[PDB]
Amino acid sequence: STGSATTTPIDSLDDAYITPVQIGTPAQTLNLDFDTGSSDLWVFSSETTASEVDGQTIYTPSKSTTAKLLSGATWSISYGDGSSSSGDVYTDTVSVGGLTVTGQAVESAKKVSSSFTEDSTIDGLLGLAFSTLNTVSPTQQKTFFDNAKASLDSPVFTADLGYHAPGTYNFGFIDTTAYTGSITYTAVSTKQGFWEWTSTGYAVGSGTFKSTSIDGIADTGTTLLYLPATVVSAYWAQVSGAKSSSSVGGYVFPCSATLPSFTFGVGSARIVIPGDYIDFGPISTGSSSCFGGIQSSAGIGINIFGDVALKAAFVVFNGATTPTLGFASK
Ligand SMILES: NC(=O)c1cc2ccccc2[nH]1
């Protein structure tokens, strides 16, 4: 089997991407944030504290003839941005772009933190990291990809995120029309539960490439690119007037600037992020200070190849017995 679904930016900045997902019988369609940096599929629901729902579409398990309470199971997750959610668990039928999993753990939120409530466009998350990070207790649950894998034509999914435009998540096949050149594959460590790999270096604009190992994670659920402070300083030094602001929480730059590109290495191959992809707009409405899309990872403990980096590439998440990651230009 295969599946193919369009993913759409939630706003004009590409802060996140939503993909329609069918849950239950008859189908209830929710728009989920596919997150290769976590491993829980959770949704706003009829059980969510009413004051914490503000415009989201909810899953109502009592209206699904295939929903079953997973007795005794609870979940609770806290994300790197400080947001969180928790609740109980049902199993139900879940379909993405024509690909159907029966018996998928659907984690129903009883509580969500303010940032989820305040984002009316995201009805939940669909985790695509390794199932060892799933938070369901006392019996850990598998991701949608792990449950589908045996049925797929090939044990892979691909992320093709758009810049200010829709893109695609495919499951079970590699669309050879969706990228240019060849796909360069690179080793993955699953030891932390993430799609963790080592970039071979970077360049700023037309500058020379610096060969240096940068260990980080491919994370569709993080907006920006988070890299070591040395690398980030070298980038922003090429932008007149750019500075790190503790009050804002990162590097800012004059909105009048033209940003240089940023290149990262994948083996001997190179992925070029155009400068415009690094502009996240005014820090507050009407400001002439703009927020940068490349930020330091120094306070995080890990480097994160988020959407800023991933949307410059066609990315293969290869879930073979020995997982790997593939990157192609597009
Ligand atoms: N137990 C947790 O709060 C938790 C698990 C996890 C996995 C990926 C990303 C964030 C996460 N938070």
Curated annotation (Swiss-Prot):
Catalytic activity, reaction form: Hydrolysis of proteins with specificity similar to that of pepsin A, prefers hydrophobic residues at P1 and P1', but does not cleave 14-Ala-|-Leu-15 in the B chain of insulin or Z-Glu-Tyr. Clots milk
Organism name: Cryphonectria parasitica
Family: Belongs to the peptidase A1 family.
All copies of domain Peptidase A1, residue ranges: 17-328
Protein name: Endothiapepsin
Catalytic-site annotation from UniProt: 35, 199
Full-protein interval shown: 90 to 419 of 419
Any single biological process term in GO: proteolysis
S-S bridge residues: 255-290
EC number(s) per entry: 3.4.23.22
One example GO MF annotation: aspartic-type endopeptidase activity
Residue intervals passing through the bilayer: none
Keywords carried by this UniProt record: Aspartyl protease, Disulfide bond, Hydrolase, Protease, Signal, Zymogen
